[PDB]
Amino acid sequence: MCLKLNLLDHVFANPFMNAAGVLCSTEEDLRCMTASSSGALVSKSCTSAPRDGNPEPRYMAFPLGSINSMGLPNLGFDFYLKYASDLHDYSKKPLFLSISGLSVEENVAMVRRLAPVAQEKGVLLELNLSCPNVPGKPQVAYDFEAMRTYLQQVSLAYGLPFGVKMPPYFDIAHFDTAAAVLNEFPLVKFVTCVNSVGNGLVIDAESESVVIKPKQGFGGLGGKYILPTALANVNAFYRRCPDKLVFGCGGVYSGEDAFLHILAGASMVQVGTALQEEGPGIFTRLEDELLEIMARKGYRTLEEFRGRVKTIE
Amino acid sequence: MCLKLNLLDHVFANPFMNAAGVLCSTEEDLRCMTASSSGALVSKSCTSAPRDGNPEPRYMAFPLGSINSMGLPNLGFDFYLKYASDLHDYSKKPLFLSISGLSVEENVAMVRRLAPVAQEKGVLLELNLSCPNVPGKPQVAYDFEAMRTYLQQVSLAYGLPFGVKMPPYFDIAHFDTAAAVLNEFPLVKFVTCVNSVGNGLVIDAESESVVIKPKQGFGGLGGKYILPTALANVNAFYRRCPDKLVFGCGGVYSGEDAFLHILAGASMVQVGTALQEEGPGIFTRLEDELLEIMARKGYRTLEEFRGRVKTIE
Ligand SMILES: Cc1cc2nc3c(=O)[nH]c(=O)nc-3n(C[C@H](O)[C@H](O)[C@H](O)COP(=O)(O)O)c2cc1C
Ligand SMILES: Cc1cc2nc3c(=O)[nH]c(=O)nc-3n(C[C@H](O)[C@H](O)[C@H](O)COP(=O)(O)O)c2cc1C
Ligand SMILES: O=C(O)c1[nH]c(=O)[nH]c(=O)c1CCc1ccc(OC(F)(F)F)cc1
Ligand SMILES: O=C(O)c1[nH]c(=O)[nH]c(=O)c1CCc1ccc(OC(F)(F)F)cc1
After folding, report:
1. Cβ–Cβ contacts within 10 Å for residue B305, how many?
2. Which of A56, B130, B135, B239 is the most buried (most CB within 10 A)?
3. What distance, in Å, lies between the first and last C-alpha atoms of chain B?
């Protein structure tokens, strides 16, 4: 009975990893995630220049999940590139490095410089498409002409397998078009579904107030609120992108939640909100809980049930 | 103290009502909602001809919410028209009639016929800008040029105040564009936010199967999953549409949740999943809990706090 996976030319002890943005902004964080029993880790989405991000409070969590408008606080690309090329212990577990440039040119400049490090050390790129373009236009993955442009230019500039982090879609027509854009880029080898459910609004009844400061309290939703949304997107892309891997992310608190992602078609399973809340010890629990479910069901590996969600008739 | 209010030239005993689709498909349902403590009721969204809807199971509910792909099962427009014109006891509470034709022309023909019943009887039109999936094109409220066409044609054909039921949006630029469309139309006097969060997917771990049969298990989400999404849409439209009313719908299971909708800007508050699960008694509880919250805060009227959610700085 084992949780091991071999994909993208790397070996993973188990499918669990942090979600970009959680426990991965500083050297301390990355060392902590590397010391954990996670199967991999991903760095905070970075920009060319370091950013302080939005004013606080900018993250809050509640029994059913979390709202955040962090605003891409990060130490800058040069720090994450240096962690990848000089500080990370690849003998421990593999590393993904997330990039979230604020223009297509910014992203190009960062991937050109990541490419030699990726080829030499085996760092894996996750391009964050669930991200600001021109303000008053939708985020990049909700503008399919912008998305095509970003994938065209990053494909050219990077030249190596990479993956994309995608926002949730809610319309079948959007699933169709999005997968068809992604399917034009043979270097996109993995798709991470999903980023936060955008622009939710949490109000505290006692104080009659929003709970985060940026954007009049509007921010992205994570946690229990979003598990069915995240399962739908994992499965919609698993079905439409047969030549690609799908990583699942959204609402994972337990081995049972991970198991459902995996049934939906997930390879890797990321943990955001619950990890932010419980801390890195969560990975032992999730591993134990998932193995307990496999044992009861007689499953010995993950490939025996990945993507095998049953439909009715 | 009482929660009485006046909107759209009608009086309401309180701001609660069913969400379209729940407890409102047959004469029996509508009679049951009429006998309840709700302040108003809305009929099931209807098409020109009767529809059996999708194969069962097509609705399922869980501790955190519901998923549905009903398929617009309804008795047809002639039935809801007759109910509006000859059966509803307007002395008890106002009636809204939801229309969801499968094309613009279908909707224009229904509204032409509904207009003299509205004039004579005071039934209010809720036009449902969600539709069944036509491969290649998004749902109507997700295609803003289609949406403007629907509204132009309906406004022309109906000629009287009406409201629109909106899917949720998740991006600020979409809120801007959607609200700008809706503000082109002076006859749109109310906006209902929100319809179910589209195409989520619930999987049962024990059976390793989806839980509803249509669309490979994909369906709209309601209930606790969607409250912060519903609050964000209510507030976004409340802010952008100062000459319109906003009706809130999504995640209401208590007087507290209702209270947050009204803080967000809601004039009426619709209950879908919680009403499906608990039955029409829910309306007396919601009344009692909302007044209790009011009492303890010293609010005597809904107007005192509607739309007064506080932001931080
Ligand atoms: C505080 C916070 C920061 C995040 N930052 C990023 C980021 O920098 N890049 C990114 O792709 N996603 C980011 N996310 C999104 C998470 O990676 C994840 O997609 C989302 O929270 C859903 O997973 P969950 O339900 O486990 O939280 C962030 C989420 C949170 C709560
Ligand atoms: C079984 C079922 C049928 C529904 N039918 C309709 C409908 O005919 N028209 C409509 O506008 N919305 C319909 N909805 C959406 C609800 O009106 C409401 O927008 C949604 O359930 C979210 O509110 P909730 O969180 O209270 O459930 C339906 C929902 C359910 C669960
Ligand atoms: O840094 C974040 O805010 C963040 N949070 C997430 O949940 N997902 C992400 O992808 C990111 C980085 C991308 C991004 C999303 C929303 C933004 O608008 C905001 F108002 F939060 F600043 C900015 C960056
Ligand atoms: O009757 C419905 O299924 C339904 N359920 C909702 O949650 N909201 C609605 O507005 C409706 C009626 C409109 C409608 C939406 C999506 C549909 O696709 C489907 F998959 F269910 F066949 C059909 C009707």
Report:
1. 16
2. B130
3. 34
Give the helix/strand (H/E) hosting B267: strand B266-271
Q: Is A46 a catalytic residue?
A: no
Cβ proximity of B72 and B115 under 8 Å: no
Experimentally, the structure was elucidated by X-ray
B70 is in an annotated binding site: yes
- Number of Cβ atoms within 10 Å of the Cβ of B27: 12
Question: What whole-number distance in Å separates Cα of residue B8 and Cα of residue B15?
Answer: 13
Nearest CA-CA distance, residue A115 and chain B, Å? 32
The position carrying tokens 């025996």 is A304
| A306 touches B: beta carbon within 8 Å | no
User: CA-to-CA distance for B250 and B21, rounded, in angstroms?
Assistant: 13
Strand A16-18 and strand A266-271: the pairing is parallel
- Asked if A160 contacts A182 with a C-beta cutoff of 8 angstroms, the reply is no
Atom of ligand 2 minimally distant from the CA of B270: 26
For residue A89, report the phi and psi dihedrals to the nearest 5 degrees.
-90, 95
Q: Phi, psi (5° rounding) for residue B154? A: -70, -40
Contacts of B229 (CB under 8 A, 6+ apart): A197, A200, A221, A225, B168, B170, B194, B197, B250
User: Which amino acid, B233?
Assistant: N
What is the dotted CATH code of the domain comprising A54-71+197-222? 2.30.26.10
Helix (H) / strand (E) element for B258: namely helix B255-264
CA distances from A16 to A22, A191, A257, A285, B248 (A): 13, 16, 12, 11, 38
Contact assessment for residue B227 and residue B257, using Cβ atoms and an 8 Å cutoff: yes
Taking the centre of ligand 2 as the mean of its atom positions, its distance from the CA of residue B19, in whole angstroms, is 6
Ligand 2 near B249 CB (within 6 A) = yes
Residue ranges per structural domain of chain B:
1-53+72-196+223-313, 54-71+197-222
Interface of B with A in 6-25 (CB under 8 A): none
Gap from CA of B196 to ligand 2 centroid (Å): 6
CATH number of A1-53+72-196+223-313: 3.20.20.70
Cβ of B250 closer than 6 Å to ligand 2, yes or no, is yes
Q: Which amino acid is at A167?
A: P
Q: To which H or E segment does residue B113 belong?
A: helix B104-121
Resolution in angstroms, to 1 decimal, for this deposition? 1.9
